[model samples]
Target: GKSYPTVSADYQKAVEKAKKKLRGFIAEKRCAPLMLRLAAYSAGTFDKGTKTGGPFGTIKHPAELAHSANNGLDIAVRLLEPLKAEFPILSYADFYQLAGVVAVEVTGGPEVPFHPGREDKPEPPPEGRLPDATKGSDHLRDVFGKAMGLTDQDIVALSGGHTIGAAHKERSGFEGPWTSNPLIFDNSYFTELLSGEKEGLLQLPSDKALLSDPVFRPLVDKYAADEDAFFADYAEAHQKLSELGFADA
Candidate 1:
């Protein structure tokens, strides 16, 4: 009935192989950042009516794709190309979060509990709508929330992505990764706060506004204190991110 795009059995094989390849990059350098960047790029391609920029689009190499944020993250895309070749079945969308889940597995973190079901968006075109790194929580919420049609709780769950990886000043002009141990996909980001307050890993006041605001705080706290909550939500949102052409959140 619907011959839409989906992962093949070969995709699973490729997933296992690519997982090992990504693991090799683990070290003080931390492959976590790269993986997240990859996910960001894969999703960054969402173009309004047309889903032109998800994993299959692979527009990251363009060097001018402003949709992909966190400056200079394009390097990850270039590095990931070989893996894309190996795992032809895995979309860039799948490769990204899959790599992240792989990092969690290799780094002794939560299993991340993932499965592959991706859909690269069809596209005539949709201009960029990724949250502005320079913006804050409301901006994060408003922009990302709108893009994914996320609710307050949904937004909180998604922000948990910050749990891993440090922000490179060179990349986003922000200092420090959200979580102290970025390699693991856990809820340590809240605990990783600089002084026991809601802050950013490169996050801006706009983002903190969402956390510090009464509306988003409890939700943030809930996710931060509750791993299961974060996990369930993260898996849901991350899954949605992988299947870019699926129905909205």
Candidate 2:
């Protein structure tokens, strides 16, 4: 008869305060991409098979930050430290996911649902759990589908996060934005995927796999053609991802 913890008024206030701060940070620093990446990386460590890793503030640990998959995330985690200090009631896990949800909303993406009850655990998950951009569909399936228990639709929908982020050569060894305007969230990522490679844009092997794989291609096509559909599915998938190992309240 165990149940999720109830969200407190103080926690809600903390979320609004953090959202205000993140809006300022995104506008001033133009780092919405980093915020979204921080949330994804923090939550993406989940291993459904073992039910061990998830959005538990572990990414801030030295061992977790040292993972190659987490390169450049130090800045994102560090940026949240001041806010964390100010809002002691909000768990880093909740705050990180909230930052991502806010980043998407302020930048014209869907309003991702959030609940703040994740416990703050400092122990880092094992490394090599994140997906590699250099690999193809099989790798994505292994990471998202097998390890995280996500569906094909979830994998394709979550890939839409690339709409607002760019790959830095120094960070991931790739370069350029996925869409022309990387700060805006839209279906352009799927549209760009439909088109062949272009100047000033980058598509990783994993990205291309979505277009090539028959099972995933329909979802990609659907999103590219219908912005509303993409937004709805992305919102749901992202909400599902943010909760991962955490019980919802």
Clashes of each: 10, 0
* Tens digit per residue, CA lDDT, model 2, 1-249: 124578988888888888888788776788888999988877888888888888888877232355454678988887767767888888888888888888898889999977778988857668745688888999998988887777899999999999998887777778889999898899999999999899999888899999889899999999999999999999988988888888831
lDDT per residue (tens digit) for residues 162-241 in model 1: 76666666666567766656666777765454245444445545446655667778876776678877778776666555
> Global lDDT of each model?
0.60, 0.84
Global local distance difference test of model 1: 0.60
TM-score computed on alpha carbons, candidate 1: 0.75
RMSD of each: 4.1, 2.1
Count steric clashes of candidate 2: 0
- Highest lDDT, which number? 2
Off by over 4 Å in 1: 1-8, 25-29, 44-52, 66-69, 88-90, 107-109, 112-129, 194-203, 246-249
Candidate 2, residue 52: CA error in Å?
A: 0.9
